[PDB]
Design a protein around this ligand. Structure first.
Ligand SMILES: CC(C)C[C@H](CP(=O)(O)[C@@H](N)CCc1ccccc1)C(=O)N[C@@H](Cc1c[nH]c2ccccc12)C(N)=O
Ligand SMILES: *[C@@H]1O[C@H](CO)[C@@H](O[C@@H]2O[C@H](CO)[C@@H](O)[C@H](O)[C@H]2NC(C)=O)[C@H](O)[C@H]1NC(C)=O
Ligand SMILES: *[C@@H]1O[C@H](CO)[C@@H](O[C@@H]2O[C@H](CO)[C@@H](O)[C@H](O)[C@H]2NC(C)=O)[C@H](O)[C@H]1NC(C)=O
Ligand SMILES: *[C@@H]1O[C@H](CO)[C@@H](O)[C@H](O)[C@H]1NC(C)=O
Ligand SMILES: *[C@@H]1O[C@H](CO)[C@@H](O)[C@H](O)[C@H]1NC(C)=O
Ligand SMILES: *[C@@H]1O[C@H](CO)[C@@H](O)[C@H](O)[C@H]1NC(C)=O
Ligand SMILES: [Zn+2]
Length: 869
């Protein structure tokens, strides 16, 4: 099949031909920011493998207007190509008159043009507000995975690595940025200038970046002499201080850790006003949402600091994992994403131990397990075809699970030997691609006995879901049963590395497991045992017999006799098994008693988090009797810890997190004191007019409480357009959405659609925010459902925005009716809409919810009433 105008397409696969091979791109881009469009040309040094009559590469929404091929030897300079477009595959065919010669280089060259992108992809247009209120424009590129083809025609696959030499024409008012340092700038006739950037090292197309803006920067040098710069709106340079501080510390770390220098001479980090992704690891020119990069001490909280540190860590980890060593294809995207996600941990634990990220890491794995316990889940490494399916590859499986199995592997292998694996892997594939298999070979190959580790992880990456390790203890015998953990299978089996402890010795006994079942002995008929120490392994464990009761009991007495991460694990698993049917809800609720003793914030916040969830499920239905006793059990129990909370910014990171956590809970639950203090602080802030200062850690709590009055809601909204801290704006918007008036919420949404006051990039989260609230769950469903067509103009399905707009408004549903409506809406989508994997997940999720209610609801009712007694 073929098009556009009659004829044919010499090639049919959406994968590209391996015959033509790019070695270098001379790229010239001439953008106009008043005209809001660009004009550009390129010259690709090709190498022909087998002889051909046609050249196939990617192009999209690019008006190509002059195709030639030149002869370094064949012919002279030169000859003209016939250009053939085929949109349904985002390809174009270049037709040669004289068949090409194997083993000879050529130069494809063309002139193309288009308008600057209209939303977050390819070479698009963004704006921002200045302190004076001036609206300003920049042109920025975002290409992963398949948008480079919208900027310049090219062999747009991660394998087709090449060097890139980029030139940009610009006005005097702007600067031009790109992957590589600027070699020279040359004055042109009509007063124009032309930046010439140093040729890039070999790199995939999705990492090519360029920006013309009037931004401001702060610069510094790492030990190995790299110039790191933080670019941002001129009026925001003050917020770039931490980023620079962290940037250097991290790049340094990574160089030492990977034993590989950052190749380039400079690394820029730039804060983009309108930025869809969280950030992008463009080699040498990493782009960020302002909330991912900018920090303001007067307005950015403790967790904020931890956020931007984390995301900075993530992106620098990419320069090695992803940039230097790139996956062959988007099926193995996890090799880039899972590792970056993991290095966040390592790199931040190393350079910033005081941020206590180590205790926050289990959340990563927990978050994904929620979805990995559904049938509709998928294996880390899975096939991907159409762009949409490639986009879909970016999720908590590729990221969280990916990072979580490595953390398992590292534990199995010890830091050093694991580290050695990664030094070798990155070195072995520098400036080239790699495949899932390639990795495991290097991680296990750090006499004559061998690491078959490959066998082990290969199953971890190739099969969906998470294992449930059952354990029976008849005296000194332990039955070991493995299952596919499900939320209430046949064929699954993992080589799952076991860990455990006895009540006797806190000494850690390791072990393996490769068969459907085995058994182990116990050198002491002991009280309890605790499998999976610190939850370092990607599996759930359920104790048969008195195992669950003894372990719980232990916590009720000397709770300190169990590792804190062991606690967090017990707490996490106990409730998961309730949803699995392997436990009865009151046993979980009966564990949350020792939380009166618990001082380790991680564990205390984990337990509390579940009780807080139940409240919100109850509160989302009109289940008043339960939701209320639930409220009054949190206010009475935990009254000690709640009352110790200062409305300040003092103590450690976990101190500050605990405070914000607790204080939010109280104000959520309408605790008289709490809501009177926040109302006070707020009224002061307003009646003083910004002059007074709310501690950052309560900034959101305060704004949200002040949001309840219409005077406050209007002030907060008006102060939303005036703020120069996007982190504050973030908190104001959340507060704006804790309102009870449908029109106030509706307005926020409508303003979001418009994307003038509230940037488009925030629509997904905003919609999500509103939906969680009882007063707003219907409104959102209505909206998404009704305006779905206009939503698909703005976003891709499945862009994270759309995927998130969907689940954000439905996943929390828990009634048969809603399941019908949603089931029926996903149906409607059966056209340009259908299909997305998210459809399944959501449905399986809404059903998991209904069943949890039926299987466990009344139990909640009486465990709570049993307490009110
Ligand atoms: C991880 C964080 C530091 C930012 C990260 C940047 P990157 O370094 O992972 C980049 N390479 C991905 C950019 C991208 C995202 C989605 C589709 C195509 C291309 C991210 O993905 N962004 C958003 C949105 C998102 C994409 N996949 C996800 C998987 C799970 C959760 C969120 C996301 C975010 N908030 O992480
Ligand atoms: C983009 O287009 C604008 C006009 O829309 C160009 O600006 C004009 O350029 C000509 C030629 O130098 C001058 O005679 C005018 O005085 C300019 N007007 C203004 C207000 O700038 C601009 O040079 C173009 N930008 C680029 C970099 O191509
Ligand atoms: C394309 O990029 C590669 C790197 O992937 C460049 O190769 C380096 O070139 C320098 C200068 O000649 C050598 O000293 C290094 O040994 C090369 N590095 C490696 C690891 O190969 C190459 O120079 C670039 N090509 C062009 C045309 O500039
Ligand atoms: C090109 O030549 C190689 C070497 O024989 C051959 O294996 C390959 O199939 C050819 N590629 C195509 C299909 O043009
Ligand atoms: C964090 O860093 C410390 C050294 O400061 C190291 O001993 C520890 O193993 C690291 N933690 C983890 C779990 O990676
Ligand atoms: C709990 O156990 C710890 C560790 O031995 C001990 O220090 C403490 O005295 C015990 N507390 C109680 C409540 O018995
Ligand atoms: Zn990433």
């Amino acid at each position: 099949p073929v098009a556009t105008n009659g004829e044919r397409f010499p090639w049919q696969e959406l994968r590209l031909p391996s015959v033509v091979i790019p070695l270098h791109y001379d790229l010239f881009v001439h953008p106009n920011l008043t005209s809001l469009d660009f004009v550009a040309s390129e010259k690709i040094e090709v190498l022909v493998s087998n002889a051909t009559q046609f050249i196939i590469l990617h192009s999209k929404d690019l008006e190509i207007t002059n195709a030639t091929l030149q002869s370094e030897e064949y012919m002279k300079p030169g000859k003209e190509l016939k250009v053939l477009s085929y949109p349904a595959h985002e390809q174009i065919a270049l037709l040669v008159p004289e068949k090409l010669t194997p083993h000879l280089k050529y130069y494809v060259a063309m002139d193309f043009q288009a308008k600057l992108g209209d939303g977050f992809e390819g070479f698009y247009k963004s704006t921002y507000r200045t302190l004076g209120g001036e609206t300003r424009i920049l042109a920025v590129t975002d290409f992963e995975p398949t948008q480079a083809r919208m900027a310049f025609p090219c062999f747009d696959e991660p394998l087709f690595k090449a060097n890139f030499s980029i030139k940009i024409r610009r006005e005097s008012r702007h600067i031009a940025l790109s992957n590589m340092p600027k070699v020279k700038t040359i004055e042109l006739e009509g007063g124009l200038l032309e930046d010439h950037f140093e040729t890039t090292v070999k790199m995939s197309t999705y990492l090519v970046a360029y920006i013309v803006c009037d931004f401001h920067s702060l610069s510094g040098f790492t030990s190995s002499g790299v110039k790191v710069s933080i670019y941002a709106s001129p009026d925001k340079r003050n917020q770039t201080h931490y980023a620079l501080q962290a940037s250097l510390k991290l790049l340094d770390f990574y160089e030492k850790y990977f034993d590989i220098y950052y190749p380039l001479s400079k690394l820029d980090l730039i804060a983009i006003p309108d930025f869809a992704p969280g950030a992008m690891e463009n080699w040498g020119l990493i782009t960020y949402r302002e909330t991912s990069l900018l920090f303001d001490p007067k307005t950015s909280s403790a967790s904020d600091k931890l956020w931007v540190t984390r995301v900075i860590a993530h992106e620098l980890a990419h320069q090695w994992f992803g940039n230097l060593v790139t996956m062959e294809w988007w099926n193995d995207i996890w090799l880039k994403e899972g590792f970056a996600k993991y290095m966040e941990l390592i790199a931040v634990n190393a350079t910033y131990p005081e941020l206590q990220f180590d205790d926050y890491f289990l959340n990563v794995c927990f978050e994904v397990i929620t979805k990995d316990s559904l049938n509709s889940s998928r294996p880390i490494s899975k096939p991907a075809e159409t762009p949409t399916q490639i986009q879909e590859m970016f999720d908590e499986v590729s990221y969280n699970k990916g990072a979580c199995i490595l953390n398992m592997l590292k534990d199995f292998l010890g830091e050093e030997k694991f580290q050695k694996g990664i030094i070798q892997y990155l070195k072995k594939f520098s400036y080239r691609n790699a495949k899932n298999d390639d990795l495991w070979s290097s991680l296990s190959n750090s006499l004559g006995e061998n690491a078959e580790v490959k066998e082990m992880m290969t199953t971890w990456t190739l099969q969906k879901g998470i294992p449930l390790l059952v354990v029976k203890q008849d005296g000194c015998s332990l039955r070991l049963q493995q299952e596919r953990f499900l939320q209430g299978q046949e064929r699954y089996l993992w080589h799952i590395p076991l860990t455990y402890s006895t009540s006797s010795s806190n000494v850690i006994h390791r072990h393996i497991l490769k068969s459907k079942t085995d058994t182990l002995d116990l050198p002491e008929k002991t009280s309890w045992v605790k499998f999976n120490v610190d939850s370092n392994g990607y599996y759930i464990v359920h104790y048969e017999g008195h195992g669950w009761d003894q372990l719980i009991t232990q916590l009720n007495q000397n709770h300190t006799l169990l590792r804190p991460k062991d606690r967090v694990g017990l707490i996490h698993d106990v409730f998961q098994l309730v949803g699995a049917g392997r436990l009865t809800l009151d046993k979980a609720l009966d564990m949350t008693y020792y939380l009166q003793h618990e001082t380790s914030s991680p564990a205390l916040l984990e337990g509390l988090s579940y009780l807080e969830s139940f409240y919100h499920m109850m509160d989302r239905r009109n289940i008043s009797d339960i939701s209320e006793n639930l409220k009054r059990y949190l206010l009475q129990y935990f009254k000690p810890v709640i009352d110790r909370q200062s409305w300040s910014d003092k103590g450690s990171v976990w101190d500050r997190m605990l405070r914000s956590a607790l204080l939010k809970l109280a104000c959520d639950l309408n605790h008289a004191p709490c809501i009177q203090k926040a109302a006070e602080l707020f009224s002061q802030w307003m009646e003083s007019s910004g002059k007074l200062n709310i501690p950052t850690d309560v900034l959101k709590i305060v704004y949200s409480v002040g949001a309840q009055t219409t005077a406050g809601w209007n002030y907060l909204l008006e102060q939303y357009e005036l703020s120069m801290s996007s982190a504050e704006q973030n908190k104001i918007l959340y507060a704006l959405s804790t309102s009870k008036h449908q029109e106030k919420l509706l307005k926020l949404i409508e303003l979001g659609m418009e994307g003038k006051v509230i940037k488009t990039q925030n629509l997904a989260a905003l919609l999500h925010a509103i939906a969680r609230r009882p007063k707003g769950q219907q409104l959102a469903w209505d909206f998404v459902r009704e305006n779905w067509t206009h939503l698909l103009k703005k976003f891709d399905l499945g862009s994270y925005d759309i995927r998130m707009i969907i689940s954000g408004t439905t996943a929390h549903f828990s009634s048969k009716d809603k399941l019908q409506e949603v089931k029926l809406f996903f149906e409607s989508l059966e056209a340009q809409g259908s299909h997305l994997d998210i459809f399944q997940t959501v449905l399986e999720t809404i059903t998991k919810n209904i069943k949890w209610l039926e299987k466990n609801l009344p139990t909640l009712r009486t465990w709570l009433m049993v307490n009110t007694r």
